[PDB]
Design a protein around this ligand. Structure first.
Ligand SMILES: CCCCCCCCCCCCC/C=C/[C@H](O)[C@H](N)CO
Lengths: 41, 293, 246, 246, 46
């Protein structure tokens, strides 16, 4: 519904906000995806 | 077929975290006591670098909460959506100063409050929305007209007030009055690189590099993106002390590789130099260890 | 069943028995440059065995009053190895490293170590002067120490004005002398450009900080060293030319 | 895979890593009073969270010539906790406890501990006199020691004329400083009546006896404590009235 | 339905050693030697 009065792309304000969160990139950046409630070692 | 060793890896040279869209806060389900061995979420191993996933349900007798707190305002898109000061120019057009123009190279590192925000992310990519507020040193507006030319790298810089560069047949310029609401302009991502870099662990050039004073260190040019000039539109000088702040917004932002927040105070613009004599400790000093205020 | 570990790249084959859990930086394996993004129009080269070895840097001894060490990548490998002779002959470069650092100690010793990679690890002049033409700056050998690896001067701010307390946002893994004598990181190519120079732009750093000081009751091994073994993966090279030392 | 243990009742959450094997007294979980047997015609109360917590008693230090300690239940909890303020306001009571006792020691120390619950743990006057009106008797603070917990005088007969050698008929679990630093018992409500008073009738006792004396070569931790953490389950309360201290 | 926390435990508040009738003494079957690791009934944990 957001609208742009120019034929360029970079004159829009909030053209698509997005919910996308991936804690696995930083919080658990592990090879062996450990179990949620087990002993890691 | 001629030799298996070359077709094996090439076939196995293919591409080697499907996170969901979280609209609200994370709710919780109930949980009862569980008295069993072998299964423990507390005793994790933070030494592996992982975050412990000791969820609230797995520690205490929790309840059922269907949360509703919105996470909309915490995303990076609306975190940098605020505009902020970037620079000031001092167009001291008077009798003594026989220049009539003032050139300022774009460096957002000059002011701390916007700087410390973008330091959290090492590589950024965005489009800008500049805003040139306009006023005199007294805060007074007057009936005058200004010119705001962007001078990219390599362009001829202006030389004076009557300079030919103000013909601006190619350079974008903003002609605006001083009795005007602030001029506002959108700016795209005009890097020669694919993404901005606030840091560069090296040098722009090859060759020798001295060890006594390294002024060329940590200066990548992919973010260094030319100058921006202003004059009053007049061939003879009008006596007024002008000072226009310049503000920018960041939109369509995409960050990468988060970086810690700088705690020490800033001392220079393009170099993150602190002082060994006054290390500003982040935490305030307490009385003793077991005396939480 | 998880404490053992067998990593083998190239003709090398490293093993660690006490350390556990490989941490992969940002959840993306190292991959070659895709067709749709590269700019170097010439064909790049993929040796994949000569260069993708576990080169071992020098041992750094840990004392009870030690401060820290650090390195720069791929700067540590430009004089040694076929990878050194490959980076001096090519303007462009891309690779992804498999860091691995070792610190052996007894079960009676104590201590911990913070190991972390630091992307674009610039340093900072240590001085209160703000005169632009007389600004203190780090020397070349201080910021590009080479295969040896220099030490810190104040590690609490990483010699960059960034507090070490927040330094775990970066990919890291703790060596702690009660449970693991070793650590490892697999890091991809992190750079805003698809390729870069190898003797100008270091892609990232590495820090090994003695957070908890080595403490042992007198009557044991006093000289604890630290060795780091490094191994590039999916290396690239392009734009062949003459040699260039620095 | 069995040495770890996670017990969480109420807002508490206890964990022990070295001790293993929960022993449940007599193979019956603690359960509420069934409908077909209760006598208290009024509705009883089931807080189930405020009271069902892991309250921690005081630390008792273990010396090389120590004798033993003991407690009484639910007598240890009548001045503290919401359970204390709930038992002082109710004539009737029913609960089932989750005992848990801890004794940390190093792998160079030695020693063992007998932990056992004793149902209806009466005590005995220590004297050869049999005059009925001049009979020796234990004092109140000796038989109801409270949160602190008194010590024994002759543990070989449990201060009741019952030999300790036969004391393993009761539910028990051994702390032994070579393999486990902790122990735990889950005991149901053991009483010949469905409910009872809380400040008159103690349902059972607990004993922690140093069978094998703590022995360590000189040059180590000399002060070994013992802590017991206790946690009622499926508590009940009925017959509300005024406060009653004792 | 009004709140799940009260119906969850109440539904799960149900009742939480079926020994046989031993008429005689306990007999025994034969047994041969068994030389294998991992399986030990001696080394218990009293
Ligand atoms: C006539 C229009 C005048 C406004 C146009 C001026 C050019 C704006 C280009 C913006 C470039 C990105 C933002 C700049 C940030 C910093 O200055 C650099 N990254 C390094 O200091």
């Amino acid at each position: 519904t957001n609208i742009n009065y120019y034929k360029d792309s970079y004159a829009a304000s909030a053209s698509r906000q997005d919910f996308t969160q991936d804690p696995k990139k930083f919080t658990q950046p592990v090879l062996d995806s450990i179990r949620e409630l087990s002993a890691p070692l | 077929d001629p030799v298996e060793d070359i077709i094996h890896d090439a076939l196995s040279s293919t591409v080697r975290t499907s996170g969901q869209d979280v609209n609200t806060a994370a709710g919780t389900a109930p949980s009862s006591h569980r008295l069993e061995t072998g299964r423990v979420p507390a005793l994790q191993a933070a030494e592996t670098g992982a975050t412990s996933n000791a969820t609230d349900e797995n520690m205490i007798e929790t309840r059922c909460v269907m949360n509703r707190n919105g996470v909309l305002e915490a995303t990076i898109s609306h975190f940098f959506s605020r505009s902020g000061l970037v620079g000031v120019v001092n167009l001291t057009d008077g009798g003594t100063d026989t220049t009539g123009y003032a050139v300022w190279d774009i460096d957002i590192m000059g002011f701390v409050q916007l700087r410390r925000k973008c330091e959290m992310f090492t590589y950024m990519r965005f489009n800008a929305e500049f805003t040139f507020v306009t006023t005199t040193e007294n805060g007074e507006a007057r009936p005058f007209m200004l010119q705001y030319m962007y001078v990219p790298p390599g362009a001829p810089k202006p030389t004076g007030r009557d300079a030919f560069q103000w013909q601006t047949a190619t350079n974008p310029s903003v002609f605006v009055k001083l009795t005007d609401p602030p001029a506002q302009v959108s700016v795209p991502f005009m890097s020669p690189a694919s993404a901005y870099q606030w840091f560069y662990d090296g040098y722009p050039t090859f060759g020798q590099h001295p060890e006594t004073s390294n002024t060329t260190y940590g200066q990548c040019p992919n973010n260094m993106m030319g100058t921006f000039a202003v004059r009053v539109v007049s061939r003879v000088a009008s006596q007024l002390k002008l000072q226009t702040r310049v503000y920018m917004k960041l939109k369509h932002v995409r960050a990468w590789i988060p970086r810690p927040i700088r705690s020490q105070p800033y001392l220079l613009k393009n170099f993150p130099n602190y002082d060994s004599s006054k290390i500003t400790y982040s935490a305030r000093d307490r009385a003793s260890i077991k005396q939480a205020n | 069943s998880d404490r053992v570990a067998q990593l083998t790249v190239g003709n090398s084959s490293i093993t660690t028995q006490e350390a556990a859990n490989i941490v992969l930086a940002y959840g993306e394996w190292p991959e070659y440059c895709p067709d749709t993004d590269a700019t170097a129009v010439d064909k790049p080269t993929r040796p994949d065995v000569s260069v993708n070895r576990f080169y071992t840097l020098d041992s750094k001894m840990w004392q009870e009053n030690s401060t820290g060490w650090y390195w720069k990548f791929p700067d540590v490998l430009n004089k040694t190895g076929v990878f050194g002779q490959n980076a001096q002959f090519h303007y462009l470069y891309r690779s992804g490293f498999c860091l691995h650092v070792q610190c052996n100690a007894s079960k009676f010793h104590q201590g911990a170590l913070l190991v972390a990679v630091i992307p674009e690890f610039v340093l900072a002049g240590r001085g209160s002067n703000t005169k632009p033409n007389e600004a203190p700056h780090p020397g070349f050998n201080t910021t590009f120490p080479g295969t040896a690896g220099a030490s810190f001067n104040d590690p609490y701010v990483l010699d960059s004005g960034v507090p070490l307390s927040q330094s775990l946002i970066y990919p890291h893994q703790w060596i702690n002398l009660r449970t693991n004598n070793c650590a490892t990181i697999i890091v991809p190519y992190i750079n805003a450009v698809p390729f870069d120079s190898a003797i100008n732009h270091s892609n990232f750093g590495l820090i090994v900080v003695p957070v908890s000081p080595l403490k042992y009751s007198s009557g044991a091994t006093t000289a604890i060293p630290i060795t780091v073994t490094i191994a590039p993966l999916n290396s690239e090279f392009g734009g062949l030319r003459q040699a260039v030392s620095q």
